[PDB]
A = this chain, B = another copy of it.
Amino acid sequence: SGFRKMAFPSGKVEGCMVQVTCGTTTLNGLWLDDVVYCPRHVICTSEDMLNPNYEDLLIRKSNHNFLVQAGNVQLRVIGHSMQNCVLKLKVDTANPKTPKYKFVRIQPGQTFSVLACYNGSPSGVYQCAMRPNFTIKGSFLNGSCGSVGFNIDYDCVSFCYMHHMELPTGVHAGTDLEGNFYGPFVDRQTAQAAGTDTTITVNVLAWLYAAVINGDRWFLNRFTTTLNDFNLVAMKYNYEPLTQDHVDILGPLSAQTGIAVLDMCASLKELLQNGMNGRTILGSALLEDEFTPFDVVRQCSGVTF
């Protein structure tokens, strides 16, 4: 029993983290096969970062301008290119700790683990969700750029996030490992506002299922609603619409608990309309939206990697 915000075991990813220096800017890189991936803004300076010409800055840069440190071993750079907002540094040596991996772009509402790194050193690991407004609510300080987000299936690491910046609201923005931004953000030193956020409805429902699996039942409501009736009330409260697709994905959790999705929707409608009346669910006084249906099945059935 119990339900915790669990990250993936981080050991396959720890073995890929390296330090990258260009000029006096130091951040993290991901060393996979014979390539180091890091944010292109490592080639920027104070003078450039307000409106950089990355094309022209990379043109001017040559291999020897990039110090790549893997612990204490300095890696020989033999090649530099840019893909979208990621710098690819070719190095003389394939990472012998390179895990089975792939680059996967996730959707809003999906979850992943962040390995927060400083000077190529893994500091810590935490689970978060890609917000519907494409921000993540991270914890990131100076020197954290190039820190990555991942999922595991079996022995395969799916890399989904590389950290680039903080928005004025204290939330965070980055790219997939192909250098494509999540959300409407650019890599320069300017205040950029995220779109107003919404709650990931399907995840709140998944977490209510987790609560029922762990004997937390007080909020259950026998008065079924319709998808339409639910979505009218969801919209008012800045919740994402629940789709028939979302209903399907809750299929397994619905079968295992015996609670109809539309019955869990009626419960959620009442919590929205009337609050918790001082009570908690799984130690929270807020409705939690950072657990996917699969995250709940994974934790509750003890899936290993």
Q: Identify the A interface with B (CB < 8 A).
A: 1-12, 14-15, 115-119, 121-126, 128, 137-144, 166, 170-172, 214-215, 276, 280, 283-286, 298-305
Contacts and interface: CB of A to CB of B under 8 A. Distances in A.
Contacts of A140: 1-2
Given A9-B11, A121-B304, A303-B116, A126 B1 contact: no
A9 B4 contact: no
Number of copies: 2
Contacts of A115: 9
Contact of A137 (B122, B144, B172, B283): B283
18 contacts: A1-B140, A1-B141, A2-B139, A4-B124, A4-B138, A5-B5, A6-B123, A6-B139, A8-B124, A9-B14, A10-B10, A11-B11, A11-B14, A11-B15, A116-B302, A122-B305, A123-B298, A123-B299
Given A122-B305, A123-B302, 17 more contacts: A2-B140, A2-B166, A5-B5, A8-B124, A10-B10, A11-B11, A11-B12, A117-B304, A118-B303, A119-B304, A124-B298, A125-B125, A139-B299, A143-B302, A144-B302, A170-B215, A284-B284
A203 to B, nearest CB: 15
